[PDB]
């Protein structure tokens, strides 16, 4: 992809008001809903469950649940046993339980062939528009950016869903970057972009046996039948040295933002739902909710292959991007799950509320998922190109450098019109197809509005069109 540096363009960026984050959020929701829609609705699963604990033969995250499930025939029912996690199952009425989202919202099963592996998505503007990338190595995330370049589209952004920690994606180029709309505003999230990744080795060691039953004509329900081996619990590992160095870097940058004698405390998420209080992420299609207290358990005072193991609970019924009336069931994956991710950033929330200063406490805050994408789209601003200019003169009637001379003076920027005028037509899953159609129609609409304006001005193909309008000194 051709990136064009804009030599002297200073451009005000605001990642917290960046329309690409709202558009990416809407696109991820639409893609999730479209991939989930043509799948099993699991209406028959909202039954009374007879759940006992999964036991060791001598004596409790998983529960062995017995239900009267429907079959391909409506006059016949089958007794089904299935292992559900405690976090998926709500106790009603001793032994009688039901699924977490059966009293509120509907739970749609993900199709068993659908892959949840994030694949880098390049968000690309239609021709006639461009995306400005901010290359300032220590960029605050807001305000004037001095090193600006233009691209048709961004680097590959993996649509990674994570909460407390940002997994995979871009790292800072020189140092940990603490970005906030207002660091003194405790209602805003603090997006930490690390310059070194912290490797997080995470697994669901359970050798789950996946069973499949029909619950209606063509409706196959996938569930855990049994565990072949020991139950254990899912967990993530980060090394003590790498994580502690990462927190050291974070406190150095926070001390740059706060007083240089401030005590910075990392503490566990003080509350909220599981998507906020734990590090919620997709590991190969399974949904992990890692306690992460052991990461944010430290008081920093201003002056070995030993890993920190984070307990992780697993959920099968997921309500991600919390919405009224929506829920998804993630089918279990046969065998043992292991994934190794890069922690490339953090979402921290400062508590505040104290008049006794010198101590600040930063707790993880899952927040919304617009912050996870903002942490990748922070470099990018969408701008509409206005290729038609008017200026006083003395007349009486490849894509390299596409927006170059934007920060240069006029005249010098009038010698580059040929390259700017070109690539305004072509540039430098129902949902994606409609967005491609909207982008192409919009690009054609703007191209033709500009060519029409040139036509009605008598400038249809001159590129530099001198006219018979005298310049009015009241204009400039």
């Amino acid at each position: 992809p051709q990136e064009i540096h804009l030599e002297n363009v200073t451009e005000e960026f605001n990642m917290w008001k960046n329309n690409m984050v709202e558009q990416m959020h809407e696109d991820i929701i639409s893609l999730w809903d479209q991939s989930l829609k043509p799948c099993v609705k699991l209406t028959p699963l909202c039954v009374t469950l007879q759940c006992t604990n999964v036991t060791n033969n001598i004596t409790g995250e998983l529960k062995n649940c017995s239900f009267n499930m429907t079959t391909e025939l409506r006059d016949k029912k089958q007794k089904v046993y299935s292992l559900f996690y405690r976090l998926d199952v709500v106790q009603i009425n001793n032994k009688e339980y039901r699924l977490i989202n059966c009293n509120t919202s509907a739970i749609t099963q993900a199709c068993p062939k659908v892959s949840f592996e994030p694949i880098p998505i390049h968000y690309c503007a239609p021709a006639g528009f461009a995306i400005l990338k901010c290359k300032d190595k220590k960029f605050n995330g807001t305000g004037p950016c001095q090193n600006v370049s233009t691209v048709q589209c961004t680097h590959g952004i993996k649509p990674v869903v994570s909460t407390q920690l940002l997994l995979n994606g871009s790292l800072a180029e020189e140092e940990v970057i603490i970005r906030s709309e207002n660091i003194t505003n405790n209602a805003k999230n603090i997006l930490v972009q690390l310059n070194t990744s912290v490797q997080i080795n995470c697994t669901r060691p359970n050798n789950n046996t996946v069973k499949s039953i029909r619950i209606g004509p063509g409706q196959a329900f996938y569930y855990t039948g049994d565990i072949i081996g020991d139950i254990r619990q899912a967990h993530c590992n980060v090394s003590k040295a790498t994580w502690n160095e990462t927190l050291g870097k974070v406190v150095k940058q926070l001390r740059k933002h706060f007083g240089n004698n401030t005590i910075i405390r990392f503490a566990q998420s003080s509350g909220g739902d599981l998507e906020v209080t734990t590090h919620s992420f997709n590991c190969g299609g399974e949904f992990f909710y890692c306690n992460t207290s052991g990461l944010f358990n430290s008081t920093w005072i201003s002056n070995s292959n030993d890993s920190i193991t984070l307990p992780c609970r697993i959920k099968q019924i997921i309500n991600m991007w919390q919405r009224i009336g929506q829920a998804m069931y993630a089918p279990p994956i046969q065998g043992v799950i292991r994934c190794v991710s890069n922690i490339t950033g953090l979402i921290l929330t400062r508590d505040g509320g104290s008049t006794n200063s010198t101590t600040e406490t930063f707790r993880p805050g899952g927040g919304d998922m617009r912050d996870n994408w903002r942490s990748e789209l922070y470099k990018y601003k969408v701008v509409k190109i206005e290729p038609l200019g008017v200026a006083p003169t003395r007349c009486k009637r490849v894509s390299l450098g596409f927006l170059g001379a934007a920060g240069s003076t006029m005249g010098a920027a009038s010698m580059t019109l040929t390259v700017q005028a070109r690539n305004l037509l072509s540039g430098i899953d129902t949902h994606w197809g409609i967005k491609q159609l909207q982008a192409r129609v919009l690009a054609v609409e703007h191209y033709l509005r500009d060519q029409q304006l040139l036509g009605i001005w008598g400038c249809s193909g001159k590129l530099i069109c001198c006219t018979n309008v005298p310049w009015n000194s009241s204009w400039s």
């Epitope: 060791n56 001598i58 004596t59 060691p205 020991d230 254990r232 619990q233 967990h235 193991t309 307990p311």
Partner: antibody, heavy 127, light 106 residues
């Protein structure tokens, strides 16, 4: 993987008892919970306490205040000190490897006690 | 503590059932030891695997409510011994040990 004990032949009444146990030719003594038991001859057997290489210790709550257990991490030897033991408290003292088998991550509690498989001997030393 | 009968008596060739019970025995594994006079109380029922206790053996153990039964198959004169059960506390703050049951074969 053998256990051999050591201690005095006689102790004074109401005096501190000191016993030791030597672990021979094992491969991973750091995994197991090293423990002592006390038995009154002809009567019930009871556990007195244990210690792990990670510094954790446990003691029988009825005895805890008078019993201290230590291990040497350099020389594989397991020591027991019991303050002010008398005839009504004493009995044969045995050392054992309350073996621990690890099934998952020990930091997460995913280990289960296997039991006192390998045992030494003991003498009801008193007065 | 874990209450045990003071003695049990079976004929040779029969299956012996030595039991113990107590509150912490409902949530923690029960280990069993066989002590001969003059010898150490070696293990007979050990824990192996987190979800079974199993273990190919002549012996075997059954968990039922607050009572745990040690089932000894093919009892012979060689099995005469003091049998003890052990279990950890519900918070694993200490190990609780039973008083023992004397098994005689007559």
């Amino acid at each position: 993987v053998q256990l051999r004990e050591s201690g005095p032949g006689l102790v004074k009444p109401s005096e501190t008892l000191s016993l030791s146990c030597t672990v021979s030719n094992d491969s991973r003594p750091s995994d197991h919970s090293w423990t002592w038991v006390r038995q009154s001859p002809g009567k019930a057997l009871e556990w007195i306490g244990d210690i792990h290489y990670n510094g954790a210790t446990t003691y029988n709550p009825s005895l805890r205040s008078r019993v201290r257990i230590e291990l040497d991490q350099s020389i594989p030897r397991f020591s027991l000190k019991m303050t002010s033991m008398t005839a009504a408290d004493t009995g044969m003292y045995y050392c054992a490897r309350n073996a621990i088998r690890i099934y998952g991550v020990v930091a997460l509690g995913e280990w289960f006690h296997y039991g006192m498989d390998v045992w030494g001997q003991g003498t009801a030393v008193t007065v | 503590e874990l209450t045990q009968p003071p003695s049990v008596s079976v004929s040779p060739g029969q299956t012996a059932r030595i039991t113990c019970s107590g509150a912490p025995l409902t949530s923690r594994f029960t280990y069993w030891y066989r002590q001969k006079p003059g010898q150490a109380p070696v293990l007979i029922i050990s824990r192996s695997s987190q979800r079974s206790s199993g273990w190919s053996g002549r012996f075997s153990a059954s968990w039922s409510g607050t009572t745990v039964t040690l089932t000894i198959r093919g009892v012979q004169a060689d099995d005469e011994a003091d049998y003890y059960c052990q279990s950890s506390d519900t918070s694993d703050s200490y190990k609780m040990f039973g008083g023992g049951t004397k098994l005689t074969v007559l």
